[PDB]
Amino acid sequence: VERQRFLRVLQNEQFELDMEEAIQKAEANKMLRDRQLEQEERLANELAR
Amino acid sequence: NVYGPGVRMGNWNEDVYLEEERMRHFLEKREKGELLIQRNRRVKKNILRPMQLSVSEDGYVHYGDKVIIVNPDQVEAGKFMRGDLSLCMSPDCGVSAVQTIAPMGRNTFTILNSCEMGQVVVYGQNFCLGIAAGLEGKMLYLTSDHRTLLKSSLKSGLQEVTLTDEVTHLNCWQAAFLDPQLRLEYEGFPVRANEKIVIYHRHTNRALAVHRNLFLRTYFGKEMEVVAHTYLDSHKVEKPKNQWMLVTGNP
Amino acid sequence: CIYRKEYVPMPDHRPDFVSRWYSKSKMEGLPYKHLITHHQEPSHRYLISTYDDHYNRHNYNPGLPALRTWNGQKLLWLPEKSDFPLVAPPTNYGLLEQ
Amino acid sequence: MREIVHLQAGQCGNQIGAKFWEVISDEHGIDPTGTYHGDSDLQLERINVYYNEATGGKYVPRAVLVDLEPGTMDSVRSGPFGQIFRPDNFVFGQSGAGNNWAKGHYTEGAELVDSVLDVVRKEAESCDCLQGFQLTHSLGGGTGSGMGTLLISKIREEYPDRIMNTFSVVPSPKVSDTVVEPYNATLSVHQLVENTDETYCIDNEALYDICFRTLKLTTPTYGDLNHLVSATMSGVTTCLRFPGQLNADLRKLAVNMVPFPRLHFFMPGFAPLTSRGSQQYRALTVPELTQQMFDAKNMMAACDPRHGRYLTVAAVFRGRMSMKEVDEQMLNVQNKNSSYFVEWIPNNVKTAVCDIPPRGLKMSATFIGNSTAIQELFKRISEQFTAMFRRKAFLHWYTGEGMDEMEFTEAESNMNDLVSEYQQYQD
Amino acid sequence: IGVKLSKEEFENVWNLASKKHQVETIRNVLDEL
Amino acid sequence: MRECISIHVGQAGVQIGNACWELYCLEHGIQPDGQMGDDSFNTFFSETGAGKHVPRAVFVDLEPTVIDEVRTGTYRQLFHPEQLITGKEDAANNYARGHYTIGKEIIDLVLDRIRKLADQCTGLQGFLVFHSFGGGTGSGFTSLLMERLSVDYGKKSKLEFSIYPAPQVSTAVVEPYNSILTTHTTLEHSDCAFMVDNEAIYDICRRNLDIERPTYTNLNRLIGQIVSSITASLRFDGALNVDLTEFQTNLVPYPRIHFPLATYAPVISAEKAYHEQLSVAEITNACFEPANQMVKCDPRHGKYMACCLLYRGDVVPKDVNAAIATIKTKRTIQFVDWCPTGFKVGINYQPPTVVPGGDLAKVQRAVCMLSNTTAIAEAWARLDHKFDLMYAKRAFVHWYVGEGMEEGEFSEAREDMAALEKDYEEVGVDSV
Hints:
This is part of a larger assembly, with chains A, B, C, D, E and F. Chain B has helices at residues 13-32, 36-47, and strands spanning 66-68, 70-71, 85-90, 94-98, 108-111, 129-131, 140-143, 162-164, 173-177, 197-201, 208-211, 225-228, 243-244. In chain B, strands 1-5-6-7-8 form a 5-stranded antiparallel sheet, with no helix packed on it. Chain B is α+β, with helices and mostly antiparallel strands. By secondary structure, chain F is an alpha/beta fold. Chain F has 14 helices and 11 strands. Chains C and D meet through helix 3 and helix 4 of C and helix 9 of D.
């Protein structure tokens, strides 16, 4: 019992960890970059105007 | 002495190649769909399908009526499952009893020597109980054979009950009354929907039981044992272990 | 008293199950045991025998049937020797059927 | 064309044969549910060598799987390969021996021998034609060295005709793991000489080199190190299981390697090793495999082979190759340095061929050697032995369950006269 | 500035900014709520 | 099915087993009212039909205030009604009362419940005694039981965690007599005598954990963790597990050497753990510094004889070989000639579970050394020295003669200590 259960369980662990962390980190970074950049752009341009 | 994953110190390069190939293989497996997550979620979604029962135009049961099999809560030993266990297909297939009360598609039995697809059911008369796995579209059947020296149940070693594809006479059950001085007066009466009636086989004359005392750890976590052995007391009436109820959906 | 002080019960100090299960594969490494000894390029079916290739098979098919061209830098007549034939499916002869 | 009976014991051997009985499952295309889902009809040829049959087409091994502790038998059938091993081929007690040889060889490891002896003749008489007996264990404790090297004296009582081959684990020189090693190492070496024929010596200091200096990892562990030993095993008998050019076997290997009734201690190797970064930058051909299998850094024992000589050298090959490039590079390496071979024998290196490497390799080899710098592994034990016997330390674990001092002082007079044989022929 | 806002959301943002004050106020109220 | 029937003798035994069985009911799912994957809680926890686990060990005190405080505490529904044994009178700092009268009056219910536990078990390895050299119940009742059990159950492992009196500072006046007498009557019926102190743990609880003014209840959990990383090998899985026989067969060379010293390496608090780096090397070099011993002795005046590194947690098994290899290249760590191997390593992977809101943090790598040293003969020299000053006046001896035992035990209990230190001096020399 323990064997099968924990085997399947930790396989799940590893796969999930990998995929989830990678995707989330990438998304966060790119999105944050884009938002900050565009916001700064529009605000500075309008203030100058 | 030893640092983390990303900083460019020591033996980083061969390990960068190592998690590069492992990360790419894991993404290939997820893209193809050979991972335990998506296979398991697809299986469990095709089992736990929220589907609908059939209400009854009177109290009585007819054939073709999509009817749950459930065993009532009982008030003998100190190992116990709390209340209203139901009969569920537990694959690995197998059969057991689970703590649920909703029709979810591994619960739902269709009532199948009678002929018409709608016909009133009576005590002491043979019928069959049908269930279907997802996308198979072929009728399974509730079965149990005369006990042999190699065919015994899992935890208890009594007569076992299982599911099979084939058609035989080891598939026909008949349901009687628990009060033992009135069943010969009840041999032909129609059966009401939610009433406590014994279930017995027709070839063995044994009866389907629920063992609330030994547990079957499954993936779903809900636990009991099913078998077929008729139980009687010192007053020689049937115990609360053997009572079964074939409930229908509410209107 | 100090016994009745300190021995107040704790409902909800559930022990973890996870660090033990992860140290198990920290030592073991379950899918890792072909990532240790596999070499070159991943490949599922690569394997065939010498009687079946040279005799019954009649040899490589997509290669040069006659030409053996002598190259520039390395001093060699390769395009027959360099193939080391690996064509087609492996040695099947009808035993899995029986 | 035989079958193979393979014995396993100790806390070691079921963590080594766990990797051994799954490379054989890999090379014959055996899934861990019991059946066969390989690709060719070549693998199915000599499936009988390692796999008896039953109903439904499933193949279960010839496994013998014994240990006093139930510590590791909960771990071998809780692996990926758990329904491939036999149910009634787990034989155990309840207690654990743990570093003594009295209660392995005479009392506590001994009452289960009649529960290993009567499982062998259930299967090893049902096999139609056996080649002999294999064993893998560690000399360092009390269940391999206590039961298996006891049973090695027991099964050679029945059949003298067959061939004993061993996969032993001598203790490491520098950093050891038990204070009572040079008794259990001492007494089982004197056991091994009379009743074993090709004894293979394996170390973990010599394998923590290879996963560090050669293959360039940063966390070498046991599972990373058990598999290079379990690569050797299926790289040994490659010709009783597959066709080729020049087939060899465990009786072909003994004739070309051991000359003598007593000079029968060996030293192994395994050729094609590299990193994970330089996987495509190497060319797996014969001028690369031969260049490293003779080197000291690619050796699985505590041997500096330059300090002595090889009296004899074995080999095997696999893979679709040609023969001239394996005819001259083992002719050059006998020629380029006559300092590292002895002169009175005219040939040294035996050549054997197969057709198929292990799955994933392209071409393969497995170095097997009878050097006389293997006597630098049995000098440190006899240095550690009598510098403990002189203070008579720890001897009341060794009088307390049935042994004497006369089982002691004659268990070094075998180790002395062994080294007194290997030093005659050194130059 | 790249933000598509409902009319009721703009009225609520102005109300929350006036409640926050005895741009910084508008950006802070839009970030918090 | 590898139980450890443990004994707790005296005020010391019950007051340390409170925290020890606290940790055993802590690390599993065991509630403090009997109720509740792994099934390695059946090595200390039986069953019934209600899932109710009841611990399999014996607690004895003739001075029933601590036992009644347990019986009325929070841990009443869990312990058995019978394996907690009281009297109505204490031995009160003498060997005579505990060994001849108050031991004799109530040794039989102890031996009854030991036989009931030992024949309800299936897989007992040995006996583990927690007792006190410096009192009345922990010395007389102790040696009476360790005669009355070694006469019955014969050859079996016997390990004694012993709350030894302190080197300089003290609590009761006439501890030299009641130390020396029970040592002479324990040496012939011991197998391994692990030794701990109290001020030597006060020093470490001041200088490592930075908590000032601690109690016995803050000292007790360090022994309560020491015993748990001692017994952890049966408790969970691992790479190289340890039965009970390997301590007793790896740690003592001779008939009368058996007195090892205990030490426990990674001692630090919660506010400091997150900023210190728990390296294997720094742990094993802290565990050899003589400021980190549980016994106040200096190892530089003598030679080691045998060690036992018992790990726990996320061991990297290459790094343990590297750590022992860099230990072995020092001259401040000395060894005798006859032990050239001189080490043992045991392994388990489960991390140490630490009590909620304690003085310790969630360590991930636990190390216990149970090594023996010839610099415990220096510790025995002082309790022979005090006896030499005291017996010459014949002080205090009437308390000893007035309950049955003669005065002629007092000469042999010094001749025994003289021959024991003769043994310890003749073993640690070189032969040439």
